[PDB]
């Protein structure tokens, strides 16, 4: 139908916007701490601690399959990256500290993203 096409164009345009959001958030991780999945070869107990691992590569795969229906779903995955790290790693670690800085800096980006998603519909 024509409606299904229009809906698909909306999803494509959201995917465009979320790709720009993802690029901007990933720039706030210059150390690349959150770039890839925590390695289960290198952290073999990880899934005993963290039930829903997340990382920027995994989000990018979901994004490119147009698998984010709305900004809430995308924010859920970004919050998992931060929240997973802040539980597994102690406060005095470069990992925890990187997550705090990513959360703080990403907030600004996500605030305007929400306005754009609402504004453009």
UniProtKB/Swiss-Prot annotation:
TM spans (from-to): none
Section of the entire sequence shown: 555 to 674 of 1058
Subunit structure as annotated in this protein's UniProt entry: Component of some HBO1 complex composed of KAT7/HBO1, MEAF6, ING4 and BRD1/BRPF2. Component of the MOZ/MORF complex composed at least of ING5, KAT6A, KAT6B, MEAF6 and one of BRPF1, BRD1/BRPF2 and BRPF3. Interacts (via PHD-type zinc finger domain) with unmodified histone H3. Interacts (via PWWP domain) with dimethylated and trimethylated 'Lys-79' on histone H3.
Known role: Scaffold subunit of various histone acetyltransferase (HAT) complexes, such as the MOZ/MORF and HBO1 complexes, that acts as a regulator of hematopoiesis. Plays a key role in HBO1 complex by directing KAT7/HBO1 specificity towards histone H3 'Lys-14' acetylation (H3K14ac), thereby promoting erythroid differentiation.
Name under which the protein is recorded: Bromodomain-containing protein 1
Subcellular location as annotated: Nucleus; Chromosome
Tissues in which the UniProt entry reports expression: Highly expressed in testis.
Residues in cross-link Glycyl lysine isopeptide (Lys-Gly) (interchain with G-Cter in SUMO2): 41
Superkingdom of this protein's organism: Eukaryota
Domain Bromo stretches: 9-113
